[PDB]
Amino acid sequence: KTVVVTTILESPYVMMKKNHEMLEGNERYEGYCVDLAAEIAKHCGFKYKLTIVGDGKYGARDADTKIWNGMVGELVYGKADIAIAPLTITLVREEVIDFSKPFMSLGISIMIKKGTPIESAEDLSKQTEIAYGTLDSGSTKEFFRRSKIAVFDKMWTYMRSAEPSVFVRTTAEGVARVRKSKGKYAYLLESTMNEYIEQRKPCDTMKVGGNLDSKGYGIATPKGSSLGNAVNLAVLKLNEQGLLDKLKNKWWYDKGEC
Amino acid sequence: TVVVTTILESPYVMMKKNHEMLEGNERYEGYCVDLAAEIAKHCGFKYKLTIVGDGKYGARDADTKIWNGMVGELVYGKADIAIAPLTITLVREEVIDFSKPFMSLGISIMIKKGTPIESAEDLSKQTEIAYGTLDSGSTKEFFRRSKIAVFDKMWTYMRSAEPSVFVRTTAEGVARVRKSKGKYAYLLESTMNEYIEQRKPCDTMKVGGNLDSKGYGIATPKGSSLGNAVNLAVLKLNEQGLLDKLKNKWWYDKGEC
Ligand SMILES: CC(C)S(=O)(=O)N[C@H]1COC[C@H]1Oc1ccc(-c2ccc(C#N)s2)cc1
Ligand SMILES: N[C@@H](CCC(=O)O)C(=O)O
Ligand SMILES: N[C@@H](CCC(=O)O)C(=O)O
Ligand SMILES: [Zn+2]
Ligand SMILES: [Zn+2]
Numbered sequence A: 001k002t003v004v005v006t007t008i009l010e011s012p013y014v015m016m017k018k019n020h021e022m023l024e025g026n027e028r029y030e031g032y033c034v035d036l037a038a039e040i041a042k043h044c045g046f047k048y049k050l051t052i053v054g055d056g057k058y059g060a061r062d063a064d065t066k067i068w069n070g071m072v073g074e075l076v077y078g079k080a081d082i083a084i085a086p087l088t089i090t091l092v093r094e095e096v097i098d099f100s101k102p103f104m105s106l107g108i109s110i111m112i113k114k115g116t117p118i119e120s121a122e123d124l125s126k127q128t129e130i131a132y133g134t135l136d137s138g139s140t141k142e143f144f145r146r147s148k149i150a151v152f153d154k155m156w157t158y159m160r161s162a163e164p165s166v167f168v169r170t171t172a173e174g175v176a177r178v179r180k181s182k183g184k185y186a187y188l189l190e191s192t193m194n195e196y197i198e199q200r201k202p203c204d205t206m207k208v209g210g211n212l213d214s215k216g217y218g219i220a221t222p223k224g225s226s227l228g229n230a231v232n233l234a235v236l237k238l239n240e241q242g243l244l245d246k247l248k249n250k251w252w253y254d255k256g257e258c
Numbered sequence B: 001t002v003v004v005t006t007i008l009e010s011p012y013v014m015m016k017k018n019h020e021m022l023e024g025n026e027r028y029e030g031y032c033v034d035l036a037a038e039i040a041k042h043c044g045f046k047y048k049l050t051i052v053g054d055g056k057y058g059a060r061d062a063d064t065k066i067w068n069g070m071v072g073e074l075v076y077g078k079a080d081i082a083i084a085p086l087t088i089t090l091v092r093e094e095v096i097d098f099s100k101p102f103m104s105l106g107i108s109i110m111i112k113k114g115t116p117i118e119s120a121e122d123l124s125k126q127t128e129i130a131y132g133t134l135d136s137g138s139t140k141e142f143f144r145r146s147k148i149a150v151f152d153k154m155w156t157y158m159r160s161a162e163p164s165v166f167v168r169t170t171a172e173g174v175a176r177v178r179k180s181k182g183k184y185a186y187l188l189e190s191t192m193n194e195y196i197e198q199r200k201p202c203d204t205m206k207v208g209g210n211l212d213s214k215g216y217g218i219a220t221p222k223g224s225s226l227g228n229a230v231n232l233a234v235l236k237l238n239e240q241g242l243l244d245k246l247k248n249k250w251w252y253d254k255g256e257c
């Protein structure tokens, strides 16, 4: 049968082609995860359908209703067979879905508007003039929520009670907030997305300091799915054959504008 | 009692200065010694650290198809788990299970300071400076299997080089760089390279970018019940910042250069 692939509109992972309206099915999209999905399916020998996650979310469990939203929810509730997206491997998610070995490394990082007097998470935590936040329903927000590290707990105490909200609905909203806030907003996001934006016009943002953590994106499947084993072996093969390195260069650096 | 196979490789597992008056697990120290203690505490098991008998990581003999090293100890039922700088590879994942990686690394170049080499391309385009890798390891297999022009050229040279450019242990490779007056460069994992760069006599250096990007995983026999719990422990330890704390403790807080 045709494998239902859940994914998310996040640059440069998955984007609508400029002429998408004249195209059909998988042909409407382009990006790192579109190329990776095609390679995994070809190596595993399956037909697939890319579907954009209905709620536009990565995946979090609602504290009250206990329902998973986002791509994680699409896998948990049987709406999709596999997630091929910049989906972070986390302990809470691994308890409900399976992940392949990581296909890409990343860490939480700081995005500033160029010229902002901030060099680290410690600098953000020790001041009040520059506001800062994260994506409202992903792994970055959960990292701060759960952190027992002094600087990060201090950052979370501030973010959770900041008014108006420092949290954003999408990466693009966070980026637009940095760009329009004249250096008064810094955005906390994954190093991969931060490095991509730093290489795009208007070239007015920058990644500053080291990463706050070290983790990876994994291809996700429903718990105990038969696809899990084959997909993990495909990620290992593609890494060893240099495909993953070739795709990162194609989507980040080969088409850099700065 | 869980039998843990591991390897004497700095700063992962090392005999303590006073090992002779110490017994069992207490004889050893290092990143993987601290990691084994953390995993066992979180998973609730007793364990015995045992050093791999042949001193190898693990490769399959082309003729007999027999696995050696820590991989072989798991395959043949001699050990329950491997907690070591054991590279996750496709050929190994076909015979043993690996947790998600607990540490990242790439193949890198070690030179004696002042050696006129900046990259793998520089090594491949000359003959004055010899270069090699560790035997029965994933670095050697990377060059053996590579279809990338520079790396295939490097392998063609290394496989036929006389005298041999390959070494039995990392320490032998490091000692060869140090004694060869800049005429030998060693190809090894960035983790081991960065550790040696921070140790006396401070005469080596990591040069250029990494040739690949991969990780070390905790390994168990295929279908072992321990695999699931150990993978969850690695994810928890990463999230708590314990993996970062151990890397800092063993590499940079213990810096001599
Ligand atoms: C054999 C490979 C498929 S792999 O599983 O090693 N993944 C590689 C594919 O691209 C790059 C690398 O991704 C990684 C992504 C994340 C990590 C980390 C784990 C724990 C950390 C800490 N603290 S950082 C390692 C490797
Ligand atoms: N990759 C993240 C989304 C982005 C973020 O949280 O910064 C996730 O899987 O939740
Ligand atoms: N970590 C490697 C050994 C070192 C090397 O090959 O450079 C392995 O697991 O085989
Ligand atoms: Zn392919
Ligand atoms: Zn602990």
Ligand SMILES: [Zn+2]
Binding pocket: B061, B062, B063, B064
């Ligand atoms: Zn033989």
